[PDB]
Amino acid sequence: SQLSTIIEQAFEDRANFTAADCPSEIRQAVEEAIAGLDNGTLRVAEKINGEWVVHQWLKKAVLLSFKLNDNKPIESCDLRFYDKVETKFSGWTEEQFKAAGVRVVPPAVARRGSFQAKNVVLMPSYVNIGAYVDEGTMVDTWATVGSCAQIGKNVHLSGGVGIGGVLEPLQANPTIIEDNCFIGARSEIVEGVIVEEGSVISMGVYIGQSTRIYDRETGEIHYGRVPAGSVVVPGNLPSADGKYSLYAAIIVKKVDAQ
């Protein structure tokens, strides 16, 4: 609340600071908020009484962190980069890596301001700022955890899986993968879609806000949400004339914990 209030008020008067002219009270709080997102003590969105709630002042902190830091050079011995977001693990000691319990397989990179819990294995992949990856989740090769995405415990994002980042609109739920979910390879969950815990997404399943998700047992079509324990494979739905088919996600069976 005391830190939260300084962030929100700084965001209201944000057309008055640059990376050069900004009072150090505001830099300290934004730096304080990024640090909290980075070690998981803060999170962009959490589940309160079964509903995911977005904490906008942390999205505002992330935006302010862009406003107040210019691009600086980032140097590999022969490769160079240029960005305003530090990488998460730069300058980390060996004692720090051991303590976090996260395996960062080269060339994996996470942005500072994202959280990975103990026993997360980052294969070559990318985790963007504001994301939270919970204990025991495997991020496989060339997978992407987008900004502010919330990934549950013991989640498997198979290779080439993209979890779409949602930063703006400030009122928007980020993309959420709940506990014990398997996302098959080359799949893409974007635009704030929620996959409820225990689901099994086959390979090649693309789910956005416009993506129709057909329940082949009920015939009902819902959007933006994969119900818990769904087994979702890619398919198509025919048109009225049967001259073409449009893409759809098909729920083919349902399974509780046991």
Smaller CB distance to a copy of itself: residue 50 or 73? 73
Q: Which of 108, 120, 166, 195 binds a copy of itself (CB under 8 A)?
A: 108
For residue 230, report the phi and psi dihedrals to the nearest 5 degrees. Answer: -80, 145
Question: Applying CB under 8 A, does 128 fall inside the site for a copy of itself?
Answer: yes
- Determine if residue 140 is labeled as part of a ligand binding site: yes
Binding residue for a copy of itself, selected from 23, 25, 118, 216, defined by CB under 8 A: 216
Helix H, strand E, coil C: the string for 127-154 is ECCCCEECCCCEECCCEEECCCCEECCC
Q: Of 49, 76, 171, 218, which one interacts with a copy of itself (CB under 8 A)?
A: 76
Catalytic annotation, pick one of 38, 86, 134, 140: 140
Q: Is 21 a catalytic residue?
A: no
165 is catalytic: yes
Q: Is 13 a catalytic residue?
A: no
Q: Decide if 149 contacts 131 (C-beta within 8 A).
A: yes
Kindly report the length of the chain.
258
Q: How far is the CB of 145 from a copy of itself (least distance, A)?
A: 10
Question: Binding of a copy of itself at residue 206 (CB under 8 A)?
Answer: yes
- Name which of 141, 200, 194 is nearest 166 in CA terms: 194
Query: How many Å apart are CA 6 and CA 216, to the nearest integer?
Result: 50
**CA 140-144-149 angle, 5° bins:** 115
- Judged by beta carbon, residue 35 or residue 105, the one nearer a copy of itself is 105
DSSP symbols for 48-81:
ETTEEEE-HHHHHHHHHHHHH---EEEE-SS-EE
Q: At closest approach, how far in Å is the CB of 227 from a copy of itself?
A: 17
- Residue positions in the annotated binding site? 103, 140
Residues annotated as part of the active site: 140, 165, 188
- Residue positions in the annotated binding site for substrate? 103, 140
